[model samples]
Structures are given as structure tokens and as C-alpha cells.
Target: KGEELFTGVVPILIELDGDVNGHKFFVRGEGEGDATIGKLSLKFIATTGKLPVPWPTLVTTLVQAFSRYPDHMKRHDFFKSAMPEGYVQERTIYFKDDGTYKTRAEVKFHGDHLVNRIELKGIDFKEDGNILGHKLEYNFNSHKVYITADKQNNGIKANFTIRHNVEDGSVQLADHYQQNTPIGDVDLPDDHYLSTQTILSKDLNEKRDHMVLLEYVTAAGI
Candidate 1:
């Protein structure tokens, strides 16, 4: 007989013992909604005996974790490194007047039964200068998914859509900083020029156009 699994508002961890590999699985409900198919928070606690698993398996499991949830995926290098030989990442760095910096990377993918878009954002402070923030977003098919940062101003938001007849391909957009706003645009030394300015400007305009067309399909839940 099948037993009813009661999952309340809080998240739950299910540990299974069998040949499928002893791994602890985590599930969380993102509020109440039809979209709440249960999110996979983490896995492999038992086998690895660690809270945060190693990178290779961690990245691999994360790709599978997207399958547990609806309309979501995660950002990982496995997708990019595995697909399209000779693919390189385009990155941007942002420096603050307060001696802080942020690095961000964006990549797109078109592969077998998959169309993925990814963004990676990292921030560092002057004191320790270690990576203080990390954010990733992966959109596969029509699902938008990601894991967030634990610190302040470190959250991530993702938007995903699906299309057919797509081949494996990816493109990275330029980065923009808060300074690029109304008043912060100032003259800089020729050597220190914000090289990303032109690429960012073009990317933003293109994204806006894409969003306009995207509204139609999303409205119809396509």
C-alpha cells in the first residue's frame, strides 16, 4: 500500500536507504501555488558526509535537482563545458568606490532537448576580499531556476522560456554597474575606459525587444 507523505509549510528532508545510493534529499515548498511541485534544496549528505558536496558531484546533482521542481533550472559549468567545443565565458567586473568588486558571467545554451540560459554573479568585500556573494540562474526549456546567496544584496532572479528546433549555442551579455545610472557617467582615462559600455548598451536594447515578444508567449503559458 502507498503511504501518504504529508509535507507541511516547512521544508522536509527524506533519507532513503537502498541500492539507489544512500543520499539525503531535501524538499521545500515555495509558498502555496500550482507551481509548487516541491523544490530540491540539496542532496548526497549521507554518501559524502558533508553539508556542501564537492564541485563535480555538486554540479551534477544540481542539474538533476532542476528536474524535481517545475519551471526552474540551475547555473553550472557542466552544461557549458560539456557542450559546444571551444566555448569561452565572457565576464565583466564591477568595482565600487568603497574598494569592493563584483564579477558576473552570463552564458546561453542550445542543445539536445535543451535550451539553457545562465548567469553567475559574485561579489567581494575589501576586508577579507573573499567571495562574499554568489548567485546563479539556469533556464532550461521554459523553466527558470536558481540557487541564491546567503548574504545581503545577494539574491538572484531568473526568467526562462522554451523554443523548438534550437541547436547548442550560447552568448554572454555585458555588465552594467550602479554607477552607469543617470549621474555616474563620467569621463575616465583612456586606459581605464569602461570597455563594456558599448556591449552592455546593445545587449540591454536587445533584451528589451526580446522581452516585448516574450510577453506574448508567457501570457499564453507556452
Candidate 2:
């Protein structure tokens, strides 16, 4: 299973249609064996247009909201249909990859586009064996663009690293870092942070790994 290393706390304030709303949220989780699970709690005033509407109502409202603009509405539908059920609107999604770990994606919508920051962590392992290796920790800031009439494209820049378990008779250093910047035309700006750190066992006989990945957009016209 997997666990969250950070509390995933954030403060947000936004203005919509002449009204302002403010809120705070916290997200945390832990992994066991290979699967990771977690929940997010949001606390905020029930402001007009900012509170969590019922899912059915929210979906219906979204459908109606986009109906006024055919092109934009179609694009929105494409994205909505492509997403999974548990995906969060302003938070992150953690998907179980194996019994011992989980992968997460932090997705954002900017104007009419999407950006994603993906990460994975190894939470549990075999009794005497640990995570063999993983290319789990990274931050990606990308934007989706229409490159052709029928195809969607991405412009992306990423900073990431890979981890290896040293206790499994593989190496003695516990963990090492390998960072990179994979370049392309992504959906968002190339501005964000991503990193991972190693957690050693008390007796120095084993080790567990943790990662933190974040994605944020700058002010418009910045």
C-alpha cells in the first residue's frame, strides 16, 4: 500500500461573476504493500457558485453551461468523457498500480486547456524485499494545444527523478537521484517544482521512499 508524505494542504481564493470565495483543503494518505489510498477534505463557507454542489447537479449545470457555446462545450465534453470517476476537479488523483504502490495525477484546467503533474510512490514491499526501482517522482507543466484539425498536441517540460532500493542487495546507498528536463510543446508553462526523499528504517535494516509533486499556473499575461 501507499501513503502520503505531505499533508497536501492549500489555501485558495477566487472571484467569479462579481463574487469572491475562499477555502482551505487538506489531502493525506498512506500506502501498504503496493496500493495507496487517501482522502481530501475541503472546508469553506457556502458561497454562491463556489460550494460543492451535488455531483448530479454539478454535472447537469456544467452540461447546460457549455451548451451555449457549441465549440467550447464540445471540447469540455471531450475532456469530461476522457476523465475517470474519482478524478478531482482542483486536487489530485491516485491510481493503484500494484498491490505495493500507487500513482497520482494532479490535473488543472487553464482557460480551455489542461495540465497534469504525475507521481508514483512505493508504499509496501515483500517482507525481505523492497521496491526494486521506480521512475515515480516528477513535476510536469504542460498545456494542451490543437496542432491540427483532428489531433490534440501537448507542449511540455518536466523535471523528474528515479529511485532504487539499496536494501534488496541491489546497492548500499539506500537511494540516489537522477533528474531531467524532458522538453516539448506542453499545455502549461515550464514553471513548477518536484522532488523526492528517502525514509530510512529505524534499525537501518530497511528503507521506504516518499515523493512530492506540485503543479501551479502563473498569473495570466505573466
Candidate 3:
């Protein structure tokens, strides 16, 4: 509730204990044309727990691993919950949105807290309807995500259109163990990252013509 972006988008905390041996991960947020939204180094300790082995690499394994991750770019839930569910040009986000986004969008997560990136470009939102601050190519896989550059001085730029996590009333099982230990004690972080990027014609500090970059990290905690 204290976050600056959408309510559903929040920090993702991953808690790894006992065996840090073969596990090492670094989340790669925005990428080159849906090549891989995320990639992880996977391995496990040997029977001796002294060394790690190359874990099998499979698409399913990656999907399952990601399943535990908070949707970093608000991949699915928001559009499903947005009013009328479409996009508005001059500050778009109207009816048409979804998980099929790169086949697309979900909730927020930057670590363990609510953080977001807002980019404003000198483009006519009224003229443009999707991400990239422009029109979608006829065959762009259409699963594109926009990565507002760090400090671009010009150009109509961006990618996958994203919708943060749930609106509200999503699920959590606290109701079952609500009475056990202080609620805070059990409020652990999730597995990975979730970041919600919203693009507009203008924001507080700057506009697209001038360029703006917002960044931060949320560390995991229990």
C-alpha cells in the first residue's frame, strides 16, 4: 500500500538457506526481443554437499523456476483487472492488454519492496497506441516490452506493453496460519524480481525530450 506504483506490483524476495553451494542467480530484467526475459544458473550440490553439478537445462525447468517468481513486468493480471481492459493513446492503457503479451504482463517486484520506473517520451500518445511509444509492427510477435533507455536524448522507443500483478483479492494462505507466530515473522520474500514500468507523456521531474531514468533495488527479508 505504501508503494509508488500499482498496488499488486510489489517486491520479490528470495530466501535461500542451508545450501548456497551450487546456486547463484542474477535476474536480467529487460532483454533483446523476447530472446529470454530471464535466465538463471542452475545446479545442485553433490551427495557430499561439497560440490555442485550441472543441473539439467530444460524449458520446463525454467518455466517452473519462473513460476515461483513474481511477474517482473506486470505480465498478466493488470489488464485483466484494468477498467474496460484496453489502451488509451494520450497516456494509453485502456481495453486491449494480457499474459500473451510477448505473449505479456504481471505484478511488481524489485527485490523486497515496491519500486517502479516511469519514462516519458516526446511522442504523441494520442497518435500512438501501444508500447515503444508507437505502433506495433504487423508481425512483431507482438509480445514486445519497452525498455525506456537510461538516458536517450531522442527517438520513439519502447517494447512489451506490461500490466502489473493482481488488482486486489488475489491469494495468500495467511487465513490458514494467521494465528501462528507474529504475522510479520512469516511474511517472507518471494523467489525473484518484478518491475512495473509505466510510460507517459510527462512525469514529475522530466519529460521524454529531456530523458529520465529511475532505478532502485529491493533486498529480500523474512
Candidate 4:
């Protein structure tokens, strides 16, 4: 695969309507930022959600939107398929002549001081363990996400304990009518964003319940 990594800023809009603690709520926003495979950081313009909404509710809604955006984008399929199944960290162990062993941990720096305006911190593999660096908290519903902030550097951090599962084998189809076309204006109500959808679930009693109703939109070439 001649696929190479690239980053760019593109216009994006997320419209969400769902049940929040049994009450209806809608959250909408449009923003642009550098986006890449399995990596995204966006800032919405005047983004707003229904008032009286809990902070956790707000975060979960957005997490659902962002996590599903990659495959929904269509234009970034190259990047999506290019994404690695999992990120890795490694440690080296050295055995002494006396049969004693010592470990030398590898370190990597994350975050950006120039783009994100944060001090660079070295991450030691031994200390951090096999932690995933993907920052968006996608497991809110399972309570596997931990968020912490401190005044030490006036910064905030989020850690996701539950990792995403990747399939070992999957099918890729190419339609005979498919043709390479130049990128054009993104239209809603098309294949990806159907404008509205409702998700349902069931319990042990076979009682069905509404999970969420979500609608989203995307715009390109901003």
C-alpha cells in the first residue's frame, strides 16, 4: 500500500437529538481542525446543547458523534483503512552475567506545546503500561473513562481504560458502477448521514426500550 499519512482541516457539523435522562435533547455544532486517521481535535462554533444537561451527558453525546464520523465521512476512507489496529509501547530487559535482570523502559512524548499549548511530558512505558493514547473518551456508558484535572499546570487529562476491538478479517467491496470522482460539496440525507435515526435496545425481560435518536451533517471545503 502506497498509502501515506496526511492531515488537513475540513469543515464538519454534528447534529444530535436523543434522550437525556428520559428527556429529549439536541446538541449541534460545526467546526474545523486538523483531522487524521484515528485522531481528531475539533472546536465548534458557538456549539450549544440543551440546558439543564449534565456535563457527562454532553461529553457522551459528542463522543458518540466523533467516534462514528470517520467511516461516515467517506472522503477519508484512505485514512481510515490506513489507521493502525492498535498503538504500542515497548520495554527492553537486560540480563546481567550473574543472572540478574534489569529493565530499561522506552519513553515517548505526547501532546503538543505549540498547537495545544501544553508542556511536553515524557511517557514511560513501564509506568504507563499498555495504555492507549487515543484521547477521546468513547467508553462513557461503561464508566471505563477517568478524567482528572489539576492546577499544577492548569491542564486537564482523560484516560480510557477500555480499548476498542478490531476485527481480524473483514470484507471490502467495490461496486462496478463506482468511479473515481473529484471531491465535491458534502450533501446531507445521502448515504452516510440519513438526517435522522433511532437506536433501540432490549433487556432480559425482552422489554424493548429506546436508546437514542441521532442525526448528523457534514460539510467540506471550508
Candidate 5:
């Protein structure tokens, strides 16, 4: 029941009623399991917040969002952008190819809780269809992650449930493609000396390490 909320991580737009509402949050963490929100910093993100919005109220609401926050707290944890959209408190996660796990994407957020569109650079769902996307949108609940299957594209066609972690209200996204395989794809230059050779070498390294780990796990079965 570990349904993913969006494409994972990428650039997303959240339109409250309309226009820009900045809240630029710069978050990066190490261990996800034992971590608490109190230790995390509240950087900027959307709707350019300031003294106009009453300090106490703004701080209180943020605390609630992280009230157990979300995650299994492992393997390069990243992302989460929140904004007030009309009658909804919406969050849209942007995605892109990080040299490690998932690729980056861009999404358009309507003035509501649900996402409206997703787009991407065709990074790697490592599978088929419109699996990897940016310019995407979705709907969610405490139990399941909902996406609109426009059918024209396979970006968001599957419905997955949230396997909430009791330790914290955290939930990892459903591993739609390779889980531990190439957890991520390292970036390569578009044009450079021996770039082809370098790219192949790096890819082989990533793949080989994963394969070796799998073999080790298999042999360790007891």
C-alpha cells in the first residue's frame, strides 16, 4: 500500500486562486526513520510569505503538516511543496533524473488539493508507456493515491494505496519501475570528450553494483 503521490520529485506549480504565492523550502535530510520535524528547517517555497500573514498562525499550520510528516525514512529522502489553494491545501512533488533514484519532472497545480497535470524529460520509468512524467497532476487521501488516467498517456494510470508507516505517518511511493536496480540515473554531458565511453562506464557500474547486491542477497537466504 505504498502508493506514490506524484512522479516523485520535480518542479511543480501551485496556484491558490491565481498568481504566485512563494514558499521556497530548501529541505535535505540524511536518515528518515528516527527524524522529527522539529529538527528540520522551514525554508522558503511558495506565495512569498511575510509579516502580512500573522506569524503565529503560519508557524502553527506548518507544524501540523509535519505532524508525523511522511516517509519510511530511508535511501536519499527528498521533496514536498505545500500551498493553500482555494478550499484545498495542496502539495505537488516535482520529479527529475537525480544521479541516484528518480528523474525530475514538472507539474501544474490547480487551485485545489488534487494535481492537474504532469510532464517530464522521458528519463526512465525503466519500463514502457507514459510512466515517467512532469506536467502531471493527481488526487490523494490518507489511504490511497489517485491519478487521472487520461488514457492518451500512461503517466498516471495506476491507483495505489498508502502503506502508512506507524512509526511516523510516512509512506514511500509504490516502486512502479526498478526499486533497487538503478535507484537513480547519474547525469551525463550532452557533448563532451569521450562522453559516450564515460556514460557507458558509469551506467555499467551502477547496474553491476545492483546485480552483485542481488546475488549476495540471494546467497544469503537462510
Candidate 6:
């Protein structure tokens, strides 16, 4: 009998009616799939009534949440795309001044469960204090890093890049915090320098290393 092997399309419908930030919204979705393949379509409508909601922000949030959370819910890679958008959280730490500082993080989120990307930039500047020709020069100029999940790997794995630039006459110092690679589930590194950086996590577990960068990420809701 072909009954055991034969498979047919099954109907699926999900409706979400809810309020976001005091604004009412409705979503209706339908899709059909067997074991391996399927398609899903969703339509969302909202009425701001007295309080209007920003459609672009709402749409981006929902879209990212939909695409990112399914894989999380199923513990597998179901939805994957290169496009990243939605609510962005950013915080910066100034080493000496805004121009001479070298630690900051930018995060894009999918609701609360998924992190779309983490971007970090570091720069050391040469400048004058504008008082009697007071000046300071740093050995380094700029650096940038980006961390993202391995899309095809079910969002379980992550990676980061390391790039740095030093002053022309500065001796090439060993990249201090370059050892901390293979990101995720581990604290990042930050070279100790002249200023106090804020640690913004739910708890106060912090240190004086490059871990401050990770704190910035946590401050952005991870």
C-alpha cells in the first residue's frame, strides 16, 4: 500500500490579534507543507486609532521576528536570509574623548530572542587639546569588527572579524585582544586604557579587559 509513503498537502492557518505599544494590530497567515517543503503567506493590518504606530518599524520588527524566531522555536534552520533590519541599539565608550576613544558596539535585534548582527569599531586619534598647542598622539588609528551568526547553521554558530590600523611611525604592537575569536557564549576582549567604560548588563559581572565590548552588546539587549 502507498498509504505509508504517500503524503498530501495539509492546510495551515494562524491568526494573531494583538496590541503593540497600545496600538491594535491583526495578522493572518496561511501555508501548506508536507515534511520537507512548503510556502507561507501572511497579511497584517493595523489601525492606529488615536495613537499612530510607525509602520516601517513595526513591519521590520515583525518581519525579523518571524524570520528569526521560527528557527529558534524549531531549534533548526527554517528561515534564512542575508537582509538585516529592525530595531537597532547602539552605545559607545570614549577612551579619552569622542575623537580619541576606541570602543563601541551596534546591535540589530529580532524581537528578544535573536541577534541579527553586532558591529564594533575602535579608533585612536591624534589631536590637539586646543590649549597652548597641547597635543596627544596614539600608536593606533582605527579598527573595525563585525559579528554575525552562521546563517546556514541554524543560528547556533557565530563568527567575528578583526581589522586594525596603526600610526605610521608607531611600532606594530601585538594586537592586544586579537586572541579572542570564535565569538559567542564567551566574553569578548578589550585592551585596558585611560578611561572608565560603562558596563550595562542585567547583572554586574564585569572585568577590565576587552569584555567591555561584550557588555555594550548586552546593554543593547543582546
What does the lDDT read for residue 47 in candidate 2? Answer: 36
For model 1, how does the per-residue alpha-carbon lDDT over 10-101 read when each residue is reduced to its tens digit? 22222222111222322111111111233233222234232221111112111211121212221221221222221122223332321222
Alpha carbon deviation, residue 216, candidate 5 (Å): 26
lDDT of 2 at 165: 24
TM-score, prediction 5 = 0.17
Question: Tens digit of lDDT per residue, candidate 3, span 25-102?
Answer: 221122111102222222222223321211111001111112112344333222112212221111222214310111
Report the lDDT tens digits of candidate 2 across residue range 1-222. Answer: 001211133222211111001122122222211101111111112233222111111110011011111221233222223222112222111112322222334433333322333343334332223222332222222322121111232322222222232323342112112121212111123232222122221223323222222222111111
lDDT tens per residue, model 4, 113-199: 101111111122221111112222222222222223222322222323222221223211111111111111111212221111222
Candidate 2 — which residues are off by over 4 angstroms?
1-104, 108-129, 132-152, 155-159, 168-222
Model 1 worst lDDT run, 10 consecutive residues: 192-201
User: What lDDT score goes with residue 171 in model 1?
Assistant: 21
Clash pairs, candidate 4, are none
| Candidate 1: segments with Cα more than 4 A from true spot | 1-86, 99-124, 127-222
Output candidate 3 Cα RMSD. Answer: 22.0
Better of 4 and 6 by TM-score: 4
Query: What's the TM-score of each model vs. the native?
Result: 0.17, 0.21, 0.16, 0.26, 0.17, 0.21
User: Which 10 consecutive positions of candidate 5 have the poorest summed lDDT?
Assistant: 212-221
What RMSD, rounded to one decimal, does every model reach? Answer: 21.6, 18.7, 22.0, 22.4, 21.6, 19.6
**Model 3, 124: alpha-carbon shift in Å?**
19
RMSD in angstroms between candidate 6 and the native structure over all alpha carbons: 19.6
Q: After the best TM-score superposition of candidate 4, give how far the Cα of residue 116 lies from its true spot, in angstroms.
A: 23
lDDT of 5 by residue, 1-222 (tens): 011223232222222121112222221111111123212222222233322111111111121111222233211111122212111122322212211122222222333222322111212232221122111112122322222222232122223222212123433233222111111211111111100000001124332111000000000001
Top model by lDDT, which number? 4
Candidate 6 TM-score over all chains jointly: 0.21
Whole-model Cα lDDT of every candidate shown, in order = 0.20, 0.22, 0.20, 0.24, 0.20, 0.24
Worst 10 residues of 4 by lDDT: 173-182
Q: Which residue runs does candidate 4 get wrong by more than 4 Å?
A: 1-6, 36-49, 63-79, 82-222
